[PDB]
Amino acid sequence: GAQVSSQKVGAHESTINYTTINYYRDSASNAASKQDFSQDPSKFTEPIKDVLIKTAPMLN
Amino acid sequence: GAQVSSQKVGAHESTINYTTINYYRDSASNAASKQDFSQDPSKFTEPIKDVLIKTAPMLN
Amino acid sequence: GSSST
Amino acid sequence: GSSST
Amino acid sequence: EACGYSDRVLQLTLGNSTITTQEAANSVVAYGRWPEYLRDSEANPVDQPTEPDVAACRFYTLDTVSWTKESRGWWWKLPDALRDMGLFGQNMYYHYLGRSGYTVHVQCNASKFHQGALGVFAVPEMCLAGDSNTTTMHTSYQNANPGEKGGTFTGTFTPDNNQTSPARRFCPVDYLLGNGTLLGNAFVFPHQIINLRTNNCATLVLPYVNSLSIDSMVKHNNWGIAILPLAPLNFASESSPEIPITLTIAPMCCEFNGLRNITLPRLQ
Amino acid sequence: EACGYSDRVLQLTLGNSTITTQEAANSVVAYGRWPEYLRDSEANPVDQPTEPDVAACRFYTLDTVSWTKESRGWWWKLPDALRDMGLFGQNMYYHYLGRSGYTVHVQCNASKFHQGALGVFAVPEMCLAGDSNTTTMHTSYQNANPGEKGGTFTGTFTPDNNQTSPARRFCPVDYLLGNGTLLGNAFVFPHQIINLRTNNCATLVLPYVNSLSIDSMVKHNNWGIAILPLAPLNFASESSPEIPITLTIAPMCCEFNGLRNITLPRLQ
Amino acid sequence: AATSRDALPNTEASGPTHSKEIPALTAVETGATNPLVPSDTVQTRHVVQHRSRSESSIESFFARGACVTIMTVDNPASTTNKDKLFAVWKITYKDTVQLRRKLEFFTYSRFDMELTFVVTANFTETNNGHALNQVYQIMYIPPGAPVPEKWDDYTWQTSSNPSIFYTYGTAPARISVPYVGISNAYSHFYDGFSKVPLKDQSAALGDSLYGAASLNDFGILAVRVVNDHNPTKVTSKIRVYLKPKHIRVWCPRPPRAVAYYGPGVDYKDGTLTPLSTKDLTTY
Amino acid sequence: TNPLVPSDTVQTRHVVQHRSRSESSIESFFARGACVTIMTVDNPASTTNK
Ligand SMILES: CCCCCCCCCCCCC/C=C\[C@H](O)[C@H](N)CO
Ligand SMILES: *C(=O)CCCCCCCCCCCCC
Ligand SMILES: *C(=O)CCCCCCCCCCCCC
């Protein structure tokens, strides 16, 4: 049941990896993976009904 | 995710090895491998533009 | 066994 | 699994 | 070479300028790295850089100094020594950021009857010690930065005791390389020796060196040039010999970022 | 365009500078020629040229002048109007030779209740007439070259009668385009009109024009910019209206040859 | 492909010589060191060389925890006139001399930092009272975050600053930190200023220290005893050990030859004579 | 909000960007223990009035 993931190696001395095994039945007990996703800001930065083309007039 | 490397065996009693597993996501947490490289001293000992041939006159 | 990411 | 150096 | 070519006879051409020499001791490329422009993979400011090319990457001759039996040594900082040199200086003061490499050509001829040896050292981050024992790190910008005239080394540390109006200048002791380390070890820095019987010049090609890809040329000097008499000047049986030392330095692969109005520094 | 694009709404970006406009009347490219660098087939000085690129080819804003009911007109010369503009001016005064094209953007907004029309003319070799009827061709370098402040047109020729100490300046009469030809014909030169009800700017892209591939920028002006009120300023029922006129000009594809020490001209 | 623990080159057997080849003659003016080996100037035998440079690799040279500071804290009686001492230290390797000198063989460096904390305590007054086991809080306060004014004020909440709660008498505390510089390498030497003095500005206004870059380079460690005031006063010391792991270094320098005198390269009068008397022709 | 980048209004060079937003992810922004309360208890002599 071992999970093997890679580290993003910052300062250097191949891919360096690390190992994780969950010891508990409840996912609440698990550490955080930090393997997170990003998304586009659009729902906040461009919430407009008609798609904005930045080279065009915002108002036409 | 286990890394298996050999030891340079100094005093003796095959290849003797040792095992390493990284426990953390951040490479900063890792121990030092000590698996290091050497380089030629030339950038400091022979920084000259024209390659030195030691049997030849340094000045010609 | 082992998963790999 | 295992890497070997 | 069988067609006459020699280690001792060189010609260097940059922009509209040429240096010749008939008594060189080869030439040095610091850390084996030739100067280069900043690569896109290492780039940092995003604006289009200014790259003046032949307008600034050319040989500039600084004021000639004089070597005598009492000379303890001289020092200059780069880019500071070139801050007033033609379009290099202009491009420097108009931009926030700038990086540059250099060809440093130190000139000093004499005769087969003179003797003496100048150690010519190029030091990355050549931090020099101050004149005070009441305050550390107190050398003023004005005194740290002499421009083309440079500064000199002394054989004696002498502390500034005027606490009301402190001198705020360096007190660089020669056998301590002006920074608290022994001069005999300065050879780990890129160097050449002008030993009068052997050669009449030193040539050091310096890459841009820094912990950053580009930086403030006006706030920070990347390289220091230190010239010290390893063996004193001597001639025939004269008590007061003199021979001149001339520095000619060329910026190489220099580029600038962050264009605005010109910087007008307080230099006195 | 169905995606909103207009002849009246433009954005110009050169170097670290951007101009926007929402009331343009298209833009003019003089003689249909976009600025270019000097081609090897037409080249003449053989030394590597300096080409400062973004450091000089950027928008420089000159001092703003004021349009009133009594204004007879204004004039500027290129490169003279830019001689003190950042690294363009520096590159100009450090080199014997230089060539350059320009984007000229004249700015003047008002309101739907004002009226008036400025003719903005770019004239190649804009030779202007002198103030004397005792001596021809006697306008001094200093008066011929006002720098960024420019000069003005007059509705009246008035001869300099001080023969002891002559003024030695131009006396450019407006309906004679300051050169003895009728202003109504100035439209054969590349031009735009700022007619306040229609547009608030003029944009002229000027190629380098000369009988030579490259020349002395310090001795010779290639282009003249002449702005004249074709229809006078008027507003509501005010007797003394005023609106500002601002010039912003960008050098384009400029290159320089013959590097030496800097030219220090007698300008007063 | 050559590694730090590889054996150095074998000596090859070499015999007598009489030629125009002149290895012994050179010219140090060029800036180069003559790359000679014994077989160039004497007769040699064949030797199979087993020695290696493993312990002098940059990593191995630095692979040790060095003490960089000693922080003092206490926990007094509640009745004291003097405030409960909590400690504040600006992080640096320049308060002590040994690791500093080793790092300064080089101009620039990159490394991950391992910090280990050894904590000791004692009684001060010739009392007979006891104290229950202490817990210490070591808070990292990066440049900008609020520095504690009192042992118990709101900043010790640490919602975002990293803190270590250390229990007395347990194994010494330890954390790692990545290469955190704002430059591509740490500068052991900065020949410059953080401000340009402008002519149009006053001298005071354009002034700054020689060789100093960011005023608060790496922030602060603040340490406190978390336990409330106790009738018998206990004083503790936190010794901080720094080890540079995963290290790279650039541009070699001559080592510090005269005593350190402040964070810069300055030297004090009276310390400038490291070398001792020895006669030129005396072994 | 106007989605502009430097190349929209000035002349730019090519830069290979290495920086990431790893430390400002929601998880990383909150990945710290924060003090939320201090509870007080005691154990007195049996003879106490309180
Ligand atoms: C809970 C404890 C956290 C401790 C966090 C410490 C973070 C700060 C790391 C400091 C790095 C210091 C590096 C050494 C000095 C530099 O080399 C030079 N002064 C040049 O920049
Ligand atoms: C998947 O996990 C199969 C491999 C097992 C590897 C060794 C497990 C190490 C000890 C985990 C103990 C159980 C935790 C409750
Ligand atoms: C690769 O690691 C797969 C083999 C796993 C071997 C046993 C791992 C031993 C326990 C590691 C625990 C996880 C560390 C957070």
Side-chain angles (χ1 to χ4, degrees):
Chain A
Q3 163 68 327
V4 185
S5 306
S6 63
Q7 310 177 320
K8 186 179 176 180
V9 183
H12 308 254
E13 191 174 332
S14 77
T15 179
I16 316 178
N17 307 316
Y18 70 107
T19 305
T20 317
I21 294 163
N22 284 151
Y23 308 124
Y24 301 95
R25 192 170 171 75
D26 312 281
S27 54
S29 295
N30 304 347
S33 79
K34 311 296 177 66
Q35 292 164 49
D36 296 307
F37 292 92
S38 283
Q39 77 183 12
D40 162 40
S42 291
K43 60 174 80 170
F44 312 117
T45 60
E46 290 163 66
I48 53 181
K49 189 172 180 291
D50 296 327
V51 148
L52 113 74
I53 296 123
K54 75 177 181 190
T55 48
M58 179 91 104
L59 296 166
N60 189 216
Chain B
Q3 163 68 327
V4 185
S5 306
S6 63
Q7 310 177 320
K8 186 179 176 180
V9 183
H12 308 254
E13 191 174 332
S14 77
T15 179
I16 316 178
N17 307 316
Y18 70 107
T19 305
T20 317
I21 294 163
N22 284 151
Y23 308 124
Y24 301 95
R25 192 170 171 75
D26 312 281
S27 54
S29 295
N30 304 347
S33 79
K34 311 296 177 66
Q35 292 164 49
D36 296 307
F37 292 92
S38 283
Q39 77 183 12
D40 162 40
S42 291
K43 60 174 80 170
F44 312 117
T45 60
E46 290 163 66
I48 53 181
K49 189 172 180 291
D50 296 327
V51 148
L52 113 74
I53 296 123
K54 75 176 181 190
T55 48
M58 179 91 104
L59 296 166
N60 189 216
Chain C
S2 304
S3 282
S4 187
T5 30
Chain D
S2 304
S3 282
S4 187
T5 30
Chain E
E1 163 76 306
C3 188
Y5 300 108
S6 171
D7 220 32
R8 302 169 171 265
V9 191
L10 315 177
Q11 185 182 315
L12 317 186
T13 298
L14 275 156
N16 61 1
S17 61
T18 291
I19 290 177
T20 64
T21 183
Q22 304 201 56
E23 289 181 71
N26 207 318
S27 56
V28 166
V29 181
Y31 306 120
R33 286 283 292 279
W34 202 268
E36 63 181 32
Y37 286 94
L38 180 54
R39 304 159 219 166
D40 302 343
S41 50
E42 293 178 341
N44 184 221
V46 303
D47 63 310
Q48 232 322 128
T50 296
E51 310 175 331
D53 182 60
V54 289
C57 300
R58 63 178 311 283
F59 286 115
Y60 299 105
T61 298
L62 328 198
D63 284 329
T64 301
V65 300
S66 182
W67 180 16
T68 77
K69 297 237 226 285
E70 0 306 315
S71 292
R72 307 307 293 209
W74 308 260
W75 60 263
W76 291 264
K77 300 304 181 76
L78 292 170
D80 181 60
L82 301 183
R83 67 190 192 201
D84 295 294
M85 297 295 198
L87 285 161
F88 172 79
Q90 292 303 304
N91 271 300
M92 176 175 130
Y93 284 121
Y94 267 103
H95 295 88
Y96 166 33
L97 304 165
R99 53 176 265 148
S100 187
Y102 308 93
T103 294
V104 179
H105 192 65
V106 185
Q107 296 139 94
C108 186
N109 51 285
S111 81
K112 285 156 161 47
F113 296 85
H114 293 59
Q115 67 194 31
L118 302 168
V120 182
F121 307 94
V123 185
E125 306 298 347
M126 191 166 96
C127 295
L128 296 177
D131 61 1
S132 174
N133 285 172
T134 62
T135 317
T136 54
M137 299 185 293
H138 196 216
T139 301
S140 73
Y141 181 92
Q142 297 70 24
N143 295 316
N145 292 294
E148 89 176 279
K149 59 171 177 294
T152 54
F153 288 88
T154 175
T156 298
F157 179 60
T158 171
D160 174 51
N161 282 123
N162 185 337
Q163 285 196 244
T164 242
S165 22
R168 287 188 81 185
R169 48 180 78 166
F170 292 131
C171 190
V173 183
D174 55 15
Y175 68 98
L176 296 179
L177 188 56
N179 62 9
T181 71
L182 291 175
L183 178 111
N185 298 323
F187 299 92
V188 303
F189 296 120
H191 64 276
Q192 288 210 301
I193 297 171
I194 301 179
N195 180 23
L196 297 177
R197 63 177 273 124
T198 302
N199 57 316
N200 65 25
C201 56
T203 303
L204 285 71
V205 182
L206 315 176
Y208 179 72
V209 172
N210 197 354
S211 61
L212 291 171
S213 287
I214 203 172
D215 202 353
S216 178
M217 288 193 134
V218 183
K219 291 174 184 188
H220 173 214
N221 285 305
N222 309 301
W223 286 97
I225 301 300
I227 299 174
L228 295 97
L230 305 174
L233 182 64
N234 239 296
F235 174 52
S237 250
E238 315 322 89
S239 55
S240 310
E242 176 286 323
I243 46 180
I245 299 170
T246 297
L247 278 65
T248 302
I249 305 177
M252 294 176 95
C253 304
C254 64
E255 66 187 81
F256 303 90
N257 286 81
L259 179 68
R260 9 120 280 223
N261 54 309
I262 194 172
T263 293
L264 301 169
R266 172 190 296 277
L267 291 172
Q268 284 88 232
Chain F
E1 163 76 306
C3 188
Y5 300 108
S6 171
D7 220 32
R8 302 169 171 265
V9 191
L10 316 176
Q11 185 182 315
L12 317 186
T13 298
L14 275 156
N16 61 1
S17 61
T18 291
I19 290 177
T20 64
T21 183
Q22 304 201 56
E23 289 181 71
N26 207 318
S27 56
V28 167
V29 181
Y31 306 120
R33 287 283 292 279
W34 202 268
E36 63 182 32
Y37 285 94
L38 180 53
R39 304 159 219 166
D40 302 343
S41 50
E42 293 179 341
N44 184 221
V46 303
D47 63 310
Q48 232 323 128
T50 297
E51 310 175 331
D53 182 60
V54 289
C57 300
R58 63 178 311 283
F59 286 115
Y60 299 105
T61 298
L62 328 198
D63 284 329
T64 301
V65 300
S66 182
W67 180 15
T68 77
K69 297 237 226 285
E70 0 306 315
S71 292
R72 307 307 293 209
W74 308 260
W75 60 262
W76 291 264
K77 300 304 181 76
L78 292 170
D80 181 60
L82 301 183
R83 68 189 192 201
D84 295 295
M85 297 295 198
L87 285 161
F88 172 79
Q90 292 304 304
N91 271 300
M92 176 175 130
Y93 284 121
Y94 267 103
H95 295 88
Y96 166 33
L97 304 165
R99 53 176 265 148
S100 187
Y102 308 93
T103 294
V104 179
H105 192 65
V106 185
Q107 296 139 94
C108 186
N109 51 285
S111 81
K112 285 156 161 47
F113 296 85
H114 294 59
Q115 67 194 31
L118 302 168
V120 182
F121 307 94
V123 185
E125 306 297 347
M126 191 165 96
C127 295
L128 296 177
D131 61 1
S132 174
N133 285 172
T134 62
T135 317
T136 54
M137 299 185 293
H138 196 216
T139 301
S140 73
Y141 181 92
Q142 297 70 24
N143 295 316
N145 292 294
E148 89 176 279
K149 59 171 177 294
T152 53
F153 288 88
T154 175
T156 298
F157 179 59
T158 171
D160 174 51
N161 282 123
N162 185 338
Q163 284 196 244
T164 242
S165 22
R168 287 188 81 185
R169 48 180 78 166
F170 292 131
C171 190
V173 183
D174 55 15
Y175 68 98
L176 296 180
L177 188 56
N179 62 9
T181 71
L182 291 175
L183 178 111
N185 298 323
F187 299 92
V188 302
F189 296 120
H191 64 276
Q192 288 210 301
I193 297 171
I194 301 179
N195 180 24
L196 297 177
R197 63 177 273 124
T198 302
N199 57 317
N200 65 25
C201 56
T203 303
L204 285 71
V205 182
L206 315 177
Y208 179 72
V209 172
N210 197 354
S211 61
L212 291 171
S213 287
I214 203 172
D215 202 353
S216 178
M217 288 193 134
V218 183
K219 291 175 184 188
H220 173 214
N221 285 305
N222 309 301
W223 286 97
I225 301 300
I227 299 174
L228 295 96
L230 305 174
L233 182 64
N234 239 296
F235 174 52
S237 250
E238 315 322 89
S239 55
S240 310
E242 176 286 323
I243 46 180
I245 299 170
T246 297
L247 278 65
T248 302
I249 305 177
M252 294 175 95
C253 304
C254 64
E255 66 187 81
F256 303 90
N257 286 81
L259 179 68
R260 9 120 280 223
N261 54 308
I262 194 173
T263 293
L264 301 169
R266 172 190 296 277
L267 291 172
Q268 284 88 232
Chain G
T3 78
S4 54
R5 69 178 189 197
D6 291 344
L8 296 178
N10 289 338
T11 298
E12 298 304 325
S14 66
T17 172
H18 189 126
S19 72
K20 304 183 198 84
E21 304 192 339
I22 49 155
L25 289 177
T26 191
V28 305
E29 295 90 341
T30 63
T33 300
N34 201 4
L36 304 198
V37 291
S39 51
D40 290 316
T41 55
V42 298
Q43 285 196 223
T44 56
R45 68 166 282 164
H46 181 234
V47 179
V48 182
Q49 185 53 257
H50 305 307
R51 286 182 286 103
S52 95
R53 284 173 180 191
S54 54
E55 216 177 334
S56 54
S57 69
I58 301 310
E59 195 75 19
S60 292
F61 184 67
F62 289 102
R64 295 291 111 108
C67 185
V68 294
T69 194
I70 299 182
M71 300 179 76
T72 307
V73 295
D74 63 28
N75 190 22
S78 50
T79 59
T80 58
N81 43 62
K82 202 177 73 198
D83 295 281
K84 179 170 169 175
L85 181 67
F86 70 90
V88 172
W89 174 62
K90 203 185 152 291
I91 301 165
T92 182
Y93 55 79
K94 292 180 177 177
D95 289 343
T96 55
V97 301
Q98 288 184 152
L99 171 60
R100 184 181 179 172
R101 198 182 190 249
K102 291 177 70 188
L103 286 172
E104 284 179 17
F105 270 88
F106 309 96
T107 312
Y108 309 107
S109 65
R110 273 178 77 96
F111 52 83
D112 286 334
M113 197 199 276
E114 186 195 76
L115 295 176
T116 311
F117 307 84
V118 180
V119 186
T120 52
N122 61 284
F123 295 112
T124 38
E125 53 220 25
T126 333
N127 201 308
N128 227 240
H130 337 273
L132 302 166
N133 201 64
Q134 296 170 308
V135 177
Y136 305 72
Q137 181 178 353
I138 305 170
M139 181 165 72
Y140 176 37
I141 302 157
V147 181
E149 272 161 21
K150 297 301 172 193
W151 86 273
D152 60 353
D153 70 20
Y154 75 93
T155 64
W156 299 101
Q157 277 178 54
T158 33
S159 58
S160 322
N161 304 349
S163 283
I164 302 170
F165 288 89
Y166 173 77
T167 293
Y168 196 77
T170 63
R174 181 180 270 175
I175 54 95
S176 294
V177 149
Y179 170 68
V180 295
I182 57 177
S183 295
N184 304 84
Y186 291 133
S187 294
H188 302 169
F189 300 81
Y190 174 67
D191 184 15
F193 297 82
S194 71
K195 309 191 190 235
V196 188
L198 295 162
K199 301 157 60 54
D200 188 303
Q201 155 230 68
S202 73
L205 241 41
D207 204 9
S208 63
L209 295 178
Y210 178 67
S214 10
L215 277 179
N216 198 352
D217 229 336
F218 310 110
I220 285 155
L221 290 189
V223 181
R224 69 172 175 157
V225 175
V226 181
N227 306 58
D228 288 335
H229 300 80
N230 188 78
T232 301
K233 183 189 176 179
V234 170
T235 295
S236 314
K237 274 166 174 190
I238 298 79
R239 283 176 173 71
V240 182
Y241 298 84
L242 198 174
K243 179 177 64 168
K245 307 156 167 185
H246 320 133
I247 184 170
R248 290 179 66 194
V249 293
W250 299 260
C251 304
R253 296 176 93 81
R256 188 65 179 188
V258 301
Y260 284 114
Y261 176 59
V265 303
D266 304 301
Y267 42 64
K268 199 177 164 189
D269 206 6
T271 65
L272 314 176
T273 59
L275 293 146
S276 55
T277 308
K278 189 69 185 191
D279 176 69
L280 193 59
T281 50
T282 289
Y283 290 107
Chain H
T1 300
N2 201 4
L4 304 198
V5 291
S7 51
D8 290 316
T9 55
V10 298
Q11 285 196 223
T12 56
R13 68 166 282 164
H14 181 234
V15 179
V16 182
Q17 185 53 257
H18 305 307
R19 286 182 286 103
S20 95
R21 284 173 180 191
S22 54
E23 216 177 334
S24 54
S25 69
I26 301 310
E27 195 75 19
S28 292
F29 184 67
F30 289 102
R32 295 291 111 108
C35 185
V36 294
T37 194
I38 299 182
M39 300 179 76
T40 307
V41 295
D42 63 28
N43 190 22
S46 50
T47 58
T48 58
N49 43 62
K50 202 177 73 198

